[PDB]
Amino acid sequence: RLPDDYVPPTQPPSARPVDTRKSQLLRTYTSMLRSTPLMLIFQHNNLTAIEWAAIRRELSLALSNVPVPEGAPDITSKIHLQVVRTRIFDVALKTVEFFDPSTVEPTTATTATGTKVPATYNHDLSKHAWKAVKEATKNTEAVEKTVYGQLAPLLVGPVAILTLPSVSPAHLGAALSVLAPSPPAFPAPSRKKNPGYYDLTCQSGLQKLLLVGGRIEGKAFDYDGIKWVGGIENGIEGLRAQLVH
Amino acid sequence: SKLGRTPLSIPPGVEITIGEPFVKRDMTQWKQQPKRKITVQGPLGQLEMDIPDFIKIDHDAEARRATLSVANRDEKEQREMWGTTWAYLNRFIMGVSEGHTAVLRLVGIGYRATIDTRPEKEEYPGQQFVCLKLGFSHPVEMGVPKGMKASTPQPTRILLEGINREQVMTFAADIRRWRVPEPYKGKGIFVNGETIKLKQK
């Protein structure tokens, strides 16, 4: 039978309960803050399901028009405009930045057979992460100089984020024209070619979404910088011009 | 109490005066607990209260704030009066600065109200009397307590005003006690948006 000291391997000791939605989200937004290189932080103000579905219908239409003959995997199906728990999404930003899993001294845990086996508790829900985040947050002015300090003012109130698996301006420019159009740089779609965009439900929602900022390659950005990044015709192409010099 | 901790913002013109602990001798009690006299003065008028001495007030003048605290949070009596004394002060401050008002709506066929004088029954010179015709064989006349101002913008609406809320809402309830709203037709006197769910027929 199983002993008492034994803890499952897929359920190590964490700072707080695990089955709660508060922790399953923190475990989610951490991975989301690591994998996704490019994300834009929006602010949503009391939309309805019909308005949400309409906004998400234009993205799908606007993101499916970009040409993808590059042989790379299909990225359109992985871009999402997600609503987040701002209170937790702010914690996930500290954990990703201050916590350093390398500073954990492993400890031997007893398996079901009672044999002591080395096991290091590095997960983001660990007391070592909860402790390093707090102690590192005591200092206030020193935090404003970091990436988290430059983004905390945006994670106030309700917010949503648009994630992209890769930094593909061709994909971002198609998404910026639907959510935060700034003509003539990122012109909204035409009426003769996209009548769905200019519908009561869709148009009534885009007025509630207010782009507030972004985060690219672990660096905070503003609505002005996002335009430039999106303005890049192609990453490889931007490198070729540098070589022509 | 999460309310007592909340500081009290003293608006311009309002002045709070806190006295020193005093005891008035009572021949029927062997020991009277000390109390503090707090006077809230401003444009509309002045109000006074006597609070227990275990309630400490840190009046900040240059900041225009006043927070209350007790000497022992683990005592039931001190916890209770902590929030009660805070609520009364919040009313005193907002009553001497802006004033409290109560609106009475008269619903029914023949329900009217008028403000006049009754020099024969006046408790003090110039006392106003709210005369109500509420389907009774006799007329209903009530004198406004000293410190309140009653008016009637419309025949079926009364408006009370005063610096003391406990005195205003107590008078509004004294008028409503003549015709309490009924559920079958809605006839009665309603105070400050009071409503009543009707019946089937």
């Binding site: 579905a53 799908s60 239409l61 439900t201 | -």
Partner: protein, 147 residues
């Protein structure tokens, strides 16, 4: 506040009647004007076909309506080739758990999930999950699905 009414009517058979009469003739809209416009926005459809309609009656009783594709149930039954029953309409299984009125291959499901995606409010829903939703309805109307 703007009211909305659900009413299923024929393709071009719009007229003051049990379906249309008491459904909209009660709120005070120009019932005759409605049946005149609906019949013009439904001429390309086979006469008699059912068509769900959501008519939004604004304040001042100025209505604007949007016709919708026929119920998926009416399509699944027509695809399963179920036996006609009462009222001249194909009927589903009274006991879906046990009874089985028909069989629809997954090719039928593909077709029934594409005329439904034709709508503009459903044009964004991926066709993959949209074909697993009709399969979720067949289990309710007593219809088997063959690969």
């Amino acid at each position: 506040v703007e009211q909305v009414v659900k009413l299923i009517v024929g393709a071009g058979q719009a007229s003051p009647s049990p379906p249309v009469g008491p459904a909209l003739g009660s709120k005070g809209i120009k019932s005759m004007d409605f049946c005149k416009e609906f019949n013009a926005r439904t001429a390309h459809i086979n006469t008699g076909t059912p068509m769900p309609v959501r008519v939004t009656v604004r304040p001042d009783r100025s209505f604007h309506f949007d016709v919708r594709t026929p119920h998926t149930s009416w399509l699944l039954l027509n695809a399963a080739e179920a036996p006609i029953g009462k009222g001249g309409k194909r009927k589903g299984a009274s006991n879906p758990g046990k009874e089985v009125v028909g069989t629809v291959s997954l090719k039928h499901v593909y077709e029934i999930a594409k005329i439904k995606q034709s709508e503009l409010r459903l044009s964004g829903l991926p066709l993959e999950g949209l074909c697993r939703a009709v399969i979720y309805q067949a289990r309710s109307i007593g219809i088997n699905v063959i690969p």
